Structure formats: C-alpha cells, structure tokens
C-alpha cells in the first residue's frame, strides 16, 4: 500500500501510495510441456466446450490465480431422488495473492460476472456467446488447524519438506472439497517411507463451531458449498523423542 520515490524530484513528496493496493499481471514464460498439453487440449474432442472456454477466459481477470469448478459437495437432487444437471455455467475463482486464502468479497466476483456474461446475462453484451448465461461465485473461509505428531524423528530436511507440502496442499484445496486425513497422510507417507510413525489431526481453533463445517466420525473435515478450507497454522509436537534417546 505504501512506497517511496527512488529518484528525488523537487517539490514532490517521496511517499507515494499504491492506488488500489495490488499489482496484478506478473507471469512467467510458458514452458514446452505446458504448451504441449494446452495445444493437445485444443484439437481433441471436448464435450462441454463452453465451460472450459469460460474458465480459460475468466482466468484472464487481473489477480485471478486459480479457477475451479463446482465441488462435489455442491450437487443437488429433486424430490424423486435423481441428480439435476445445472442449466447455467458457474465456477469459483481464487485470488491467492491478494486476499486471505484467496477468497474475494462478493463485489469483486459480481464485477467479474458482469464483465464475463453481460447485463442482463445472455444477450451477447459480454465475452460469453449469445444465449450463454451463468455466474462466477466465491466462498467463505473455514479456519482449520493441522497438527503433525511423530515428525521429530525425521531429519530436518524431511520435516521441513513435509510441513511445506502440507501447507501448500491445504492452501490450494478448492472450495467445496473435504479435507480428509488420508490425503495428508499420503503427503506424509510419500516422503517418510511406508514404515514411519506419522499421525495428523485436523481441529478447529479453540474448538469453536464454524458455519459450513462438520467433523465426520472419521476425523475428516466435511466442508459445505461456498466454503473453503483455510490453514490457520501447522504445529509440530516434538516431545523430545529422538533416534538416540538422550
């Protein structure tokens, strides 16, 4: 939000302010395998071409970092008990670099919908084709705390990389997806080996009840629609247990 002028100019105060407070756009050169898999995604036969087109276009908004589809916890059923196919085109967006958890307020995503579909939607007054309606959505955060037990016996490199991988996995988890214990254990087992003791635990801060969260018996963390898991902190309980035993 605040910055200084490098070169001094007479009569101009050195303190300048980032109008808006964010600096979008920065991206790196596209590699060869990424371009190959993007080009192969153009020739091949694609059902529901409209949804992928809209996602690729919406990814061009400033500071949009990730785009996700409607998660599995976001389906629905009629009274008879059959899945209903959605008639619109809806998905999420994640500004992982500007807001907290990447979740934006409702106004930003409303502006993105107005730019993408038009007003009123479906008239071809926007990027989307004629008769193409829908809506971009956001999610609300649910703070989850993650505790790793049994990691002190690993070499510092292993514990460090496991912490980093668990953090990066929870941060990139799409909205409307459960945070199962089995996923974290396999981020652990894939490093520590198949005969290492490792136990993870997912809790809520201060054991407070949060909207859009249910702890299944398993110990997982069911998260409902329009909500997203958010890493509060990763704590390691190194109760002095080591390999030597001193």
């Amino acid at each position: 939000t605040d910055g200084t002028l490098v070169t001094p100019v007479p009569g101009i105060s050195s303190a300048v302010t980032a109008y808006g407070g964010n600096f979008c756009g920065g991206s790196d050169e596209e590699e060869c395998e990424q371009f190959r898999t993007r080009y192969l995604q153009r020739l091949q036969y694609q059902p529901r071409f409209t949804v992928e087109w809209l996602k690729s276009k919406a990814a061009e908004w400033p500071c949009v970092t990730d785009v996700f589809d409607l998660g599995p916890n976001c389906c629905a059923v009629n009274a008879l008990g059959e899945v209903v196919c959605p008639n619109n085109f809806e998905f999420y967006v994640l500004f992982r670099d500007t807001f907290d958890c990447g979740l934006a307020p409702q106004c930003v995503v409303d502006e993105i919908t107005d730019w993408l579909f038009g007003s009123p939607q479906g008239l071809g007054l926007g990027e989307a084709e004629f008769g193409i309606c829908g809506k971009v959505r956001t999610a609300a955060p649910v703070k989850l705390d993650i505790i790793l037990d049994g990691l002190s016996c690993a070499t510092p490199a292993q514990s460090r990389v496991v912490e980093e991988r668990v953090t990066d996995f929870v941060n990139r988890l799409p909205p409307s997806t459960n945070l199962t214990i089995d996923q974290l254990r396999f981020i652990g087992l894939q490093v520590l080996g198949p005969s290492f003791n490792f136990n993870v635990a997912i809790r809520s801060p201060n054991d407070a009840v949060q909207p859009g969260l249910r702890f299944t018996s398993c110990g997982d963390a069911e998260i409902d629609c329009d909500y997203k898991a958010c890493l509060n902190s990763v704590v390691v309980i190194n109760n002095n247990v080591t390999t030597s035993g001193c």
């Binding site: 599995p72 916890n73 389906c75 629905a76 059923v77 009629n78 009274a79 899945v83 249910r214 409902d224």
Partner: protein
C-alpha cells in the same frame, strides 16, 4: 436429538415440517439437505429408534420384535377407556368426570352434576 446436526431449515428442504416447538435455540430443528453426498447419520437413527422404543413401552406393555403392529396396539389401548382400572373407594364431590361439553372434551366435578340434577 432426532434432528440432523448440520441440516437445513424446513423451507430449504423437502419432506420437512416446520413449526416444531423446541425448548431453547440450543437444539433447533434441522433436516437432511438435498445433496447427493449425504448419508443418514446413524446416531440420529439411534435417537429416532430410541424415541419409538420409549413410546412403545408405555402403558406397561412390552415390545415384540416378531410382530409389527405394536404402536397401533398401544394407540388402541389409549382409546380404550374400558381398559381404565376400576376405582376401589367411593367418589366424593371433589372428584372429576370427563365429557363432551358444548363440543369440547372437558371435565366437571360431581358437585356440579348433583347441582344440575337436583334442579
């Protein structure tokens, strides 16, 4: 209780009846949502079956697992005033009798009965 822990309100679901009078906001009325990924909570089923068990044991009758008409039987016994046990002593003026008065099922004491008949 017999409601789902993380459910929805009556008007956000189907086969859901609202207007249920519950004691304290602590345990409100929430029903299973209409989403493919919902499995019936076994504990809620335990609460329901416990409720029907507590109800079926009323009037002293014991439950039978083989036959399935038991709640009908206890309900019939409820509307079976002929099954009400006879009184051992003699009633006085302060006792009560049930009857349909002006269309509503109410009660009246023996004293008002003798007052009306003596007129």
């Amino acid at each position: 209780g017999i409601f789902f822990s993380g459910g929805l309100a009556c008007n956000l679901t189907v086969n859901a009846a609202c207007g249920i009078a519950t004691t304290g906001d602590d345990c409100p009325a929430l029903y299973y949502p209409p989403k493919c990924n919902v499995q019936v909570d076994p504990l809620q089923m335990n609460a329901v079956i416990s409720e029907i068990a507590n109800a079926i044991n009323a009037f002293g009758n014991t439950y039978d697992c083989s036959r399935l008409d038991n709640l009908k039987q206890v309900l019939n016994r409820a509307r079976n005033i002929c099954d009400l046990p006879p009184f051992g002593d003699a009633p006085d003026m302060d006792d009560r009798i049930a009857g349909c008065f002006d269309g509503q099922s109410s009660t009246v004491t023996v004293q008002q009965l003798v007052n009306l008949v003596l007129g």
